[PDB]
């Protein structure tokens, strides 16, 4: 029985609005609607893994869970498993997964975030789950943000306590905020960004809709608008949205957005909006195509339509040698030659490096590197030709150019990361000088960049 080397996984995200759900939900978990769809002809074909996140949820984790899995194994004929399942107040996320995964499944991680303060603590915020699969890892985050036109701040801070504290993965890489910690991150949910337009053009908003002309509707997305400059989700992939807005419907029909000010409303206007996303960030050089990303058309108990998205992952296997895991494998080294960082910091403390990848034994601490200022006002931290040399556990090219190495650039003060990044092994060539290069970011916001050459030798 072979090990894959890629999975689809689903991605689904539904603020139910409190409601239960129709008896029916089959569509979307099919990918059918609108938007990019799945092609009728997969139909009874499983995707190797069902992440299923909730907002506004008003079932029991039970309750859901047995619509869910009857759901699958209507489609399927499939049994599936439960992998995870994680609720803070009415945000829930559940994994499930085909039973042959059961015993390539492992290091379950649960966790949530409580966003806001005071007023603002007690209903917004985030729930995870991460897994190993076989040697890649996995991460998943459902949010429900901040509600209100005039709260895009609120949402962009929300999303960076949501990444700074929401404690998934290896623990070990204790530099790393979850936007490293996996060869793939699915961030999904009620992100609740909206469509920043006069509320004077709710009617015309409506007819665009109604065309299915999104162009200029999706010019004033704030979710688009604040991604373009770089003030959230930086460093993730959006597939083009190609459905029409998924809040705020009347219930029962899709014929209707209800948009207009109420007193259940805070006497706020909802202009029909995109606040229903899924978002992903893989390594680099890893394999990820969003194959689905659309909204159903027949799910109606709720103020918002459920979105679907699906994905084809690259995976690897958990590769065991003569030699590691348990040793280091004297054929294999990394090399990096000409290394500098380049960091926006203001501050004047000497750093060192990390090095931290599952190919080596416990991460590498480098020396100091040498500060000059740049041309611009930058601080250039050179490492030169003083990089330790890495030893990695296996030398075979079949694993290790898969592999990836994360970047910590530490102050010698305080022992601090200002800026973590990402480093892939997939070269055009071994025992070849190439260049590498990645960005740096601490708390999700680029403070720098790493750049330079690696030499890679492996067994071949
Ligand atoms: C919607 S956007 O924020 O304006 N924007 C457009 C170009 N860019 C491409 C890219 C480069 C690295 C990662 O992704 C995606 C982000």
């Given at each position: 029985?072979?090990?894959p080397?890629?999975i689809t996984?689903?991605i689904?995200?539904?603020?139910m609005g409190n409601?239960?759900?129709?008896?029916?939900?089959?569509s979307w978990?099919?990918?059918?609607?609108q938007?990019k769809?799945?092609?009728?002809?997969?139909?009874?074909?499983?995707?190797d893994?069902?992440?299923?996140g909730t907002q506004?949820?008003?079932?029991?984790e039970?309750?859901?869970l047995?619509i869910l899995k009857?759901?699958?194994?209507?489609?399927?004929?499939?049994?599936?498993?439960?992998?995870?399942?994680?609720?803070?107040?009415?945000?829930?996320?559940?994994?499930?997964?085909?039973?042959?995964?059961?015993?390539?499944?492992?290091?379950?991680?649960?966790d949530?975030?409580?966003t806001?303060?005071?007023?603002?603590?007690?209903?917004?915020g985030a729930?995870?789950?991460?897994?190993?699969?076989?040697?890649?890892?996995?991460?998943?985050?459902?949010?429900?943000?901040?509600?209100?036109?005039?709260?895009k701040?609120?949402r962009?801070q929300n999303?960076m306590?949501?990444?700074?504290?929401?404690?998934?993965?290896?623990?070990?890489?204790?530099?790393?905020?979850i936007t490293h910690?996996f060869?793939?991150?699915?961030?999904?949910?009620?992100?609740?960004y909206?469509?920043?337009?006069?509320?004077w053009?709710?009617?015309?908003?409506?007819?665009?809709?109604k065309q299915?002309?999104?162009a200029?509707?999706?010019?004033?997305d704030?979710?688009?608008?604040?991604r373009?400059e770089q003030?959230?989700?930086?460093?993730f992939?959006?597939?083009?949205i190609?459905?029409?807005?998924?809040?705020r419907?009347?219930?029962?029909?899709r014929?209707?957005?209800?948009?207009?000010?109420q007193?259940?409303?805070?006497?706020?206007?909802?202009?029909?909006s995109?606040?229903?996303?899924?978002?992903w960030?893989?390594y680099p050089?890893?394999?990820?195509v969003?194959?689905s990303?659309?909204?159903?058309?027949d799910?109606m108990?709720?103020?918002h339509?459920?979105?679907?998205?699906?994905?084809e992952a690259?995976?690897?296997?958990?590769?065991?040698?003569?030699?590691?895991?348990?040793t280091?494998?004297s054929?294999?080294?990394?090399?990096?030659?000409?290394?500098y960082?380049?960091?926006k910091t203001?501050?004047?403390t000497?750093?060192?490096?990390?090095?931290?990848?599952?190919?080596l034994?416990?991460?590498?601490?480098?020396?100091?590197?040498?500060?000059?200022?740049?041309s611009?006002?930058?601080?250039?931290?050179?490492?030169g030709e003083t990089?330790?040399?890495?030893?990695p556990i296996?030398?075979?090219?079949?694993?290790?150019?898969?592999?990836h190495?994360?970047?910590?650039i530490?102050?010698?003060?305080?022992?601090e990361?200002?800026?973590?990044?990402?480093?892939?092994l997939?070269?055009?060539a071994?025992?070849?000088q190439?260049?590498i290069?990645?960005?740096?970011t601490?708390?999700?916001?680029?403070?720098?960049?790493?750049?330079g050459?690696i030499?890679?030798?492996?067994?071949?």
């Amino acid at each position: 029985q072979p090990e894959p080397d890629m999975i689809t996984i689903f991605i689904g995200t539904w603020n139910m609005g409190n409601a239960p759900p129709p008896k029916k939900i089959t569509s979307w978990f099919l990918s059918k609607g609108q938007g990019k769809t799945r092609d009728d002809s997969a139909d009874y074909i499983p995707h190797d893994i069902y992440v299923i996140g909730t907002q506004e949820d008003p079932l029991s984790e039970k309750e859901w869970l047995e619509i869910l899995k009857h759901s699958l194994q209507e489609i399927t004929s499939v049994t599936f498993k439960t992998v995870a399942i994680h609720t803070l107040w009415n945000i829930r996320i559940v994994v499930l997964a085909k039973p042959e995964h059961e015993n390539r499944i492992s290091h379950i991680c649960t966790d949530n975030v409580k966003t806001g303060i005071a007023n603002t603590l007690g209903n917004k915020g985030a729930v995870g789950v991460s897994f190993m699969f076989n040697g890649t890892s996995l991460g998943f985050v459902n949010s429900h943000l901040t509600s209100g036109s005039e709260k895009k701040l609120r949402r962009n801070q929300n999303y960076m306590n949501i990444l700074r504290f929401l404690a998934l993965g290896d623990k070990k890489l204790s530099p790393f905020n979850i936007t490293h910690r996996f060869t793939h991150l699915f961030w999904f949910g009620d992100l609740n960004y909206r469509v920043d337009l006069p509320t004077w053009e709710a009617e015309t908003i409506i007819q665009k809709i109604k065309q299915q002309q999104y162009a200029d509707l999706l010019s004033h997305d704030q979710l688009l608008t604040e991604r373009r400059e770089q003030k959230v989700f930086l460093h993730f992939e959006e597939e083009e949205i190609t459905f029409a807005p998924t809040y705020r419907f009347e219930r029962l029909t899709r014929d209707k957005y209800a948009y207009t000010k109420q007193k259940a409303t805070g006497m706020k206007y909802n202009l029909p909006s995109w606040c229903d996303r899924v978002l992903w960030k893989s390594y680099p050089l890893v394999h990820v195509v969003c194959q689905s990303y659309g909204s159903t058309s027949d799910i109606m108990t709720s103020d918002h339509s459920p979105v679907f998205a699906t994905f084809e992952a690259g995976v690897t296997s958990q590769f065991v040698s003569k030699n590691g895991p348990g040793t280091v494998d004297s054929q294999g080294q990394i090399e990096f030659l000409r290394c500098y960082a380049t960091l926006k910091t203001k501050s004047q403390t000497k750093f060192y490096l990390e090095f931290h990848s599952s190919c080596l034994e416990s991460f590498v601490k480098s020396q100091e590197g040498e500060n000059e200022e740049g041309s611009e006002g930058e601080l250039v931290v050179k490492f030169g030709e003083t990089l330790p040399k890495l030893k990695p556990i296996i030398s075979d090219p079949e694993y290790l150019l898969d592999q990836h190495i994360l970047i910590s650039i530490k102050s010698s003060d305080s022992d601090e990361s200002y800026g973590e990044g990402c480093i892939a092994l997939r070269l055009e060539a071994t025992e070849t000088q190439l260049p590498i290069y990645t960005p740096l970011t601490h708390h999700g916001e680029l403070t720098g960049h790493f750049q330079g050459e690696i030499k890679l030798q492996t067994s071949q």
